């Protein structure tokens, strides 16, 4: 028996191949263009992620094509809050909204204001999420808004490609801003606030049970020996977390990328809108997580490195692999406001006790250490909000930092565990929703934990040290933000 996986992302679809027993066979990448036609907008043709899943399905199947005609079930992941907008006759009324797109900031301010959608969703409205991009076609595209017959997720127009079904999970569609995300139910309510219907919605299904069947002209195109399945899938943080096996309460992953992300699964619907954290369904039934989002994490770190000329890599081999006790200078991340846990657009970011002594390292630690400290302020606002984070895992790039590592876990006082190589992301969590579809399995006992490379302790002779750095952190926010 063969699991493919599919994850479109933003920048590319990847296809994932595993056995069963979730060991990697072979993957694939098409690649993806994102048009920025006017400031703020980001748009992709959904045409172009046919082209790109194609491309990476054919180029798989060419070099394991015995294995791939042993496929049995298809998961699929996907980029969140993407507003595909079809006709009556499934046609593409205009390219998909992106995440990152911001062209609706007045439309989800409008909406955010409304106490229905925190008490529906128990999330912010924020422009990149689908209802106020609908608000917006509604007011400046309003020929294709008459038109609109159906509102997909771009991983579940995929699905609409490879099944013929409209079928969208709980964790993509909690990201919509029309899902009452503690019943795992459209919201009439909402729909009605932003000019749609529920018929206009894909139908729900949890994400690993299963939500269609390949369509038989892609099934004998590629050779599909058996009734393939294709899974709910989920949304990537989502699908990312079932690679991680970040499925069960308490278990939590932070993500060092171009932003941070504290991932933690919860037991039950826990949001916490008032302190800027994001809970959303999980691909699982009756489990949730929540999100904590660092707008400025790796990208901080980027930053910085283009104001002293050197790189990232260059930057962490200076600075070594030995943690330091902090010094005078701290640095708050906020270049681009703050998302978890102020939700403020105006502050920025600052680096603080400066001193003829700091150098270009010390520097680059307050930059580490700051993050850190963002890390922790997500940590406390998760646990203000019903969740107790125990163990923690660490992925994404700036994960490859060994001074980073021991900053958050003397930070945050939790052991931090890195993975054995591989990827155990967003396409290997679809792949293993697909298993669990295909064969019936508890969902629980297919997301494991991968196996821990190294595990990184906190500092015990620095927590204190850490503790003192961290109340500067804090300190400074609301002596800068009396500023704004």
């Known amino acids: 028996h063969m699991y493919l996986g599919l994850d479109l992302g933003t920048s590319g679809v990847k296809a994932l191949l595993i056995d069963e027993a979730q060991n990697p066979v072979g993957a694939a990448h098409g690649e993806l263009d994102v048009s920025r036609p006017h400031p703020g907008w980001s748009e992709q043709d959904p ?3 046919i082209k790109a899943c194609r491309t990476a399905i054919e180029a798989l199947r060419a070099a394991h094509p015995k294995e791939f005609s042993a496929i049995t079930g298809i ?9 595909t907008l079809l006709d009556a006759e499934d046609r593409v009324l205009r390219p998909c909204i992106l995440w990152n797109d911001t062209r609706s900031y007045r439309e989800a301010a409008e909406l955010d204001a409304d106490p229905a959608f925190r008490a529906i ?12 991009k609908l608000v917006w076609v509604a007011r400046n595209e309003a020929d294709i808004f008459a038109r609109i017959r159906k509102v997909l997720l771009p991983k579940d127009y995929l699905r609409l490609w490879l099944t013929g079904e409209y079928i969208s999970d709980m964790s993509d569609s909690a990201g919509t801003s029309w899902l009452d995300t503690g019943a795992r139910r459209w919201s009439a309510e909402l729909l009605a606030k932003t000019g749609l219907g529920e018929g206009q919605m894909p139908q729900l299904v949890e994400g690993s049970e299963a939500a269609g069947c390949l369509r038989a002209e892609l099934a004998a195109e590629w050779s599909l020996t058996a009734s393939v399945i294709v899974a709910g899938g989920a949304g990537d943080n989502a699908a990312s977390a079932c ?11 932070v993500s060092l990328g171009t932003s941070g992300v504290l991932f933690a699964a919860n037991g039950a619907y826990q949001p916490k809108p008032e302190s800027a954290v994001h809970a ?5 039934p009756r489990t949730w997580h929540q999100m904590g989002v660092i707008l400025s994490a790796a990208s901080a770190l980027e930053w910085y490195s283009k104001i002293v000329g050197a790189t990232p890599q260059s930057l962490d081999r200076e600075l ?9 200078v701290t640095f708050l991340p906020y270049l681009s406001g703050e998302r978890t846990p102020y939700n403020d657009a105006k502050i920025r970011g600052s680096f603080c006790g400066l001193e003829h002594e700091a150098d270009r390292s010390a520097l680059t630690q307050a930059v580490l250490e700051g993050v850190a400290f963002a890390i922790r302020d997500n940590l406390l606002a ?20 060994t001074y980073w590592l021991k900053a958050i876990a003397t930070a945050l006082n939790v052991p931090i565990a890195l993975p054995e190589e591989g990827d155990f992301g967003a396409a290997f969590g679809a792949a293993r929703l697909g298993l669990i579809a295909a064969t019936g399995a508890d969902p629980f006992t297919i997301c494991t934990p991968p196996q821990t490379a190294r595990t990184i302790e906190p500092e015990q002779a620095l927590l204190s040290a850490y503790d003192e750095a961290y109340q500067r952190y804090h300190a400074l926010y609301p002596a800068l933000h009396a500023l704004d």
């Open 121 to 132: 969703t128990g999330n912010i409205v924020f422009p990149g999420f689908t209802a106020p």
């Open 47 to 49: 045409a172009q992620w």
């Open 75 to 83: 998961g699929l992941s996907g980029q969140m809050h993407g507003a």
């Open 280 to 284: 959303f369904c999980h691909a699982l």
């Open 382 to 401: 998760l646990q203000s909000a019903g969740t107790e984070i125990t163990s923690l895992t660490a992925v994404g790039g700036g994960s490859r930092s």
């Open 243 to 253: 690679g991680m096996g970040t499925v069960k309460p308490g278990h939590a992953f």
């Open 320 to 328: 070594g692999e030995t943690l330091k006790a902090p010094g005078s």
